[PDB]
Nucleic acid binder design. Structure first.
Ligand SMILES: O=C(Nc1cn[nH]c1)[C@@H]1C[C@H]1c1cccnc1
Lengths: 416, 553
DNA sequence: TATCCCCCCTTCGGTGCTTTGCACCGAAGGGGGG
């Protein structure tokens, strides 16, 4: 029995008090069945009304699975959980995981159930199961073990996880392993067959350890080697109209905050006359010179962009139509870290909320692999429809912190 | 003999102490009445006397809202509520009868003084102490406490809900055929049993509630239909709002208008077609709360429409789990819509109105997306399922809007129903400049220190007009320039603004806005045939941008 | 000169750039029903 580790909080800042969003009937049924079974096994014990604490709860059916898995939002608890960032239980980030042929994820979340939680801090994991039509009051409950989603659960489980990881890591130094929340990120430079065989071995090792001391057969693949930051490229053309010339000047201005090397003076001189937009302006020698030099600069990769460990990550998203999205992770509004683009998927060709959900999941997974801090999203969606429909297509097990934006960027600068 | 109910601990604030305040003297009659009631409750057992061992107390006042002069007693628990363990009331949503299921036999139980049956905390009775002056304050006061849950206290409803749930959970486990919804005082019980078997079950439940000492008077216990339940008269096959009457005033003041608005909104749950927008329009600009606001023609027309709808009573129906929820929306105009959540033709299950103005520049499609969102969330809360909308919008318009708008939107499921006034895009802009149109270069400039500025346009052919105006902000100078450029040319026109703010409105495609300027621009843009706008970096020597900038400098 | 919950309006106060006017959220207080 792992002895309990006392956990403190921020001085003079109370715990989580968040309202419960309404849920559908099937999700409520699955949630109540899971909670009753977990009480039968002693993981959760019913709690009284004296608790001034609550966190939401959602039921999500994960990929290639048919039974729902209870997900409890823990963002407020994570943000207010102090000292856990500076406690040495935090994981150093392997800088070699960005460059690997394949990465596989595992559902090692259930392994956290076997460690008892600190009793003094225990009052903060309260959660309510709502009722349909307000027939009955909230069926309140409380974990008795390590929760799934708290930033301190993997931190406390570091010792027992390392006691299992070191034999495998010692045997095979090639494989690099990282852990964020309930997820094990494991990758290698081997081919598909060798990677799958080694991952089988690893899962067998974990299962045998569990035997000796929502589906456990799930597996998701990732390929970090197919990610490239995409510089913006100017349109290729030889016959130019006034409208196209001026909109390219606009794009050069749009790129003037990214780089200091773009020169616009000559092409501004080309537009001294007040001609009609449809009028055709053949390009001149100086105009071609500036255009070619600027295109070379844009091809030249960005410089001056660097990571700062003490700052947050921001992941803007712009909708570009026809199921095309973009994203720009950064820490300071000019020095973009990693841009990108998410093409359309299959099955979501008529669902913008679904497409944004998949984009969120793919951005977060990427950023976790690259750096290990999830980015603070800036979603281009309506808050109420998001809160109403994000659950039905979400299939991850961790939730980032997002803020919404309502002012239109009105930019095709990133859309090529 | 009796079955006790275990307490639930409470505490004050750490570092902060309890309530030490006193009230002011009341009327001698009210004081005597309260004293009698308190002595009666003492000899009943709820209230015990307080000696010198509890020095500080809490003030108590007298109210007469119940009946006329009932001398109903309530205590000023303000300081206590300011200083005790904050609670989390988990049951806050009020039930709606639409979701009730058609039980063949129904009975409503009402618990009398059940807030007083549950006990209190021993430690906190010292802080739950109150004192009443003697008759006409001959003696300074008689000091009391509560060995039961006080009426009007932070945690009273929470603790009562928890206690009643604890009591009724065994009974619910006993029988999976009987449904027992409860909100605070009421205890609706319903089942598909026979007329005698259900009565026997209710009798046994009542005895089971007398086991812990709860009392339910037979007079309040309903016997035959109809059953009046928390404001909704529940007939066997039709819920209905308890009938209400609106004031027939001829000098309508602000609070009378507000009461009219409130009762109309409350009755909107079942009566289809109630409108309150122009009626509420009177409330804008609060100056004096005593005078009488004249009823304008629009207000009186809306009021007459509400009255003529309210003349006849209409009844809803209970939900039936074996059928599929279908909703509908009609566009009343000016920003008002209607709900017809039903399951069978011409059998409503609910009705409502959406009238919130979200955004200073929005249009019909966005407001129909906020309408269906509200229907969806309320349907989730009340039923657990999302209904099948019957939208007025047309598939082509919805596709052309959602594939091209910059945010992300989604409407669950619907089929287009042909019923005017339809929602459609009034004007669709252009993305590429056309061949056979002019070109307007517009620009607005003004100074904050001058409160005046000049705006104008310089087309390709040399036409120029600089119209000076004052008191109009810069974003407004630009908007004016776009207005001039629209007014000057013909059905087709290419307009090249240099302002970043301006283009957002026009591209958003509004049909209505707070600003008259924007409303004029909308009128012009509907009138024109093919309009293309364009942005240009300001102050970069780009064609006529600086040419007109120098003039408006 | 009592408490607490849903909902419906309007007023003013904070945000963010949308740059300082403008759009856009958040409670305060107004009524309806418990
Ligand atoms: O629960 C109720 N139902 C009811 C319907 N009509 N009249 C009464 C009582 C109104 C609520 C109450 C009021 C003040 C303090 N605590 C509780």
């Amino acid at each position: 029995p792992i002895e309990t580790v006392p956990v403190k909080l921020k001085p003079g800042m109370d715990g989580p008090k968040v309202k419960q969003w309404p849920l559908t009937e099937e999700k409520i049924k699955a949630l109540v069945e899971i909670c009753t079974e977990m009480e039968k096994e002693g993981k959760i014990s019913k709690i009284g009304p004296e608790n001034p604490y609550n966190t939401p709860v959602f039921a999500i059916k994960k990929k290639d699975s048919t039974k729902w898995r209870k997900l409890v939002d823990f963002r407020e608890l994570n943000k207010r959980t102090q000292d856990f960032w500076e406690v040495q239980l935090g994981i150093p980030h392997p800088a070699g995981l960005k460059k690997k042929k394949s990465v596989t994820v595992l559902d090692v979340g259930d392994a956290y159930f076997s460690v008892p939680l600190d009793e003094d801090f225990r009052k903060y994991t309260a959660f309510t199961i709502p009722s349909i039509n307000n027939e009955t009051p909230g069926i309140r409950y409380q974990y008795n073990v390590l929760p799934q989603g708290w930033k301190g659960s993997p931190a406390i489980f570091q010792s027992s996880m390392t006691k299992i990881l070191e034999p495998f890591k010692k045997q095979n130094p090639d494989i690099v392993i990282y852990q964020y929340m309930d997820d094990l990120y494991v990758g290698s430079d081997l081919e598909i067959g060798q990677h799958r065989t080694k991952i089988e071995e690893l899962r067998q090792h974990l299962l045998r350890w569990g035997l000796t001391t929502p589906f456990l057969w799930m597996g998701y693949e990732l390929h970090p080697d197919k990610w490239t930051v995409q510089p913006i490229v100017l349109p290729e053309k030889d016959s130019w109209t006034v409208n196209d010339i001026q909109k390219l000047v606009g794009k050069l201005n749009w790129a003037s905050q990214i780089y200091p090397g773009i020169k616009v003076r000559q092409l501004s001189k080309l537009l001294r006359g007040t001609k009609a937009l449809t009028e055709v302006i053949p390009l001149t020698e100086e105009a071609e010179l500036e255009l070619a030099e600027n295109r070379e600069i844009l091809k030249e990769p960005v410089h001056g962009v660097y990571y700062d460990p003490s700052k947050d990550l921001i992941a803007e998203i712009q909708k570009q139509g026809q199921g095309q999205w973009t994203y720009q992770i950064y820490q300071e509004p000019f020095k973009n870290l990693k841009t990108g683009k998410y093409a359309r998927m299959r099955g979501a060709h008529t669902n913008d909320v679904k497409q944004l959900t998949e984009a969120v999941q793919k951005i977060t997974t990427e950023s976790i692999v690259i750096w290990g801090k999830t980015p603070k999203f800036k979603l281009p969606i309506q808050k109420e429809t998001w809160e109403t429909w994000w659950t039905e297509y979400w299939q991850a097990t961790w939730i980032p912190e997002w803020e919404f934006v309502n002012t239109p960027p009105l930019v095709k600068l990133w859309y090529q | 003999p009796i079955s006790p109910i275990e307490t639930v601990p409470v505490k004050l604030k750490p570092g902060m102490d309890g309530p030490k305040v006193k009230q002011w003297p009341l009327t001698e009659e009210k004081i005597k009445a309260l004293v009698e009631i308190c002595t009666e409750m003492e000899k009943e057992g709820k209230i015990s006397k307080i000696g010198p061992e509890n020095p500080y107390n809490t003030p108590v006042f007298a109210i007469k809202k119940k009946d006329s002069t009932k001398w109903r007693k309530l205590v000023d628990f303000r300081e206590l509520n300011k200083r005790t363990q904050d609670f989390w009331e988990v049951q806050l949503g009020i039930p709606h009868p639409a979701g009730l299921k058609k039980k063949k036999s129904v009975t409503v139980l009402d618990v009398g003084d059940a807030y007083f049956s549950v006990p209190l905390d021993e430690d906190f009775r010292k802080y739950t102490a109150f004192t009443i002056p003697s008759i006409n304050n001959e003696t300074p006061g008689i000091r009391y406490q509560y060995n039961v849950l006080p009426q009007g206290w932070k945690g009273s409803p929470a603790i009562f809900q928890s206690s009643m749930t604890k009591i009724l959970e065994p009974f619910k486990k006993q029988n999976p055929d009987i449904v027992i919804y409860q909100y605070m005082d009421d205890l609706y019980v319903g089942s598909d049993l026979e007329i005698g078997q259900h009565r026997t079950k209710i009798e046994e439940l009542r005895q089971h509630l007398l086991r812990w000492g709860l009392t339910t008077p037979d007079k309040k216990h309903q016997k035959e239909p109809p059953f009046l339940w928390m404001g909704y008269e529940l007939h066997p096959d039709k819920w209905t709002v308890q009938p209400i009457v609106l004031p027939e005033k001829d000098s309508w003041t602000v609070n009378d208008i507000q009461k009219l608005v409130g009762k109309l909104n409350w009755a909107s749950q079942i009566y289809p077609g109630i409108k309150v927008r122009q009626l509420s329009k009177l409330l804008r600009g609060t100056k004096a709360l005593t005078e009488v606001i004249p009823l304008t023609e629009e207000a009186e027309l809306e009021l007459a429409e509400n009255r003529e709808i309210l003349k006849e009573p209409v009844h809803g129906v209970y939900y039936d789990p074996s059928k599929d929820l279908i909703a509908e929306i009609q566009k009343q105009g000016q920003g008002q819509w209607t709900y017809q959540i039903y399951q069978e033709p011409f059998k409503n299950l609910k009705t409502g109105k959406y009238a919130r103005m979200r955004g200073a520049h929005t249009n019909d499609v966005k407001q129909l997306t906020e309408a269906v969102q509200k229907i969806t969330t309320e349907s989730i809360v009340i039923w657990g399922k999302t209904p099948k909308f019957k939208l007025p919008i047309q598939k082509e318009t919805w596709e052309t809007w959602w594939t091209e708008y910059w945010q992300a939107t989604w409407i669950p499921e619907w089929e287009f129903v042909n019923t005017p006034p339809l929602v459609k895009l009034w004007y669709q802009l252009e993305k590429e400049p056309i061949v056979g149109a002019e070109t307007f270069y517009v620009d607005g400039a003004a100074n904050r220190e001058t409160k005046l500025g000049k705006a104008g346009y310089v087309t390709n052919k040399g036409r120029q007009k600089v119209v000076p105006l004052t008191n109009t902000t810069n974003q407004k100078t630009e908007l004016q320039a776009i207005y001039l450029a629209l007014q000057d040319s013909g059905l087709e026109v290419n307009i090249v603004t240099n302002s970043q703010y301006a283009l957002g409105i026009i591209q958003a495609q509004p049909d209505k806005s707070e600003s008259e300027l924007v409303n004029q621009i909308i009128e012009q843009l509907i009138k024109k045939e093919k309009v293309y706008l364009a942005w240009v970096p300001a102050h970069k020597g780009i064609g006529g941008n600086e040419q007109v900038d120098k003039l408006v400098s």
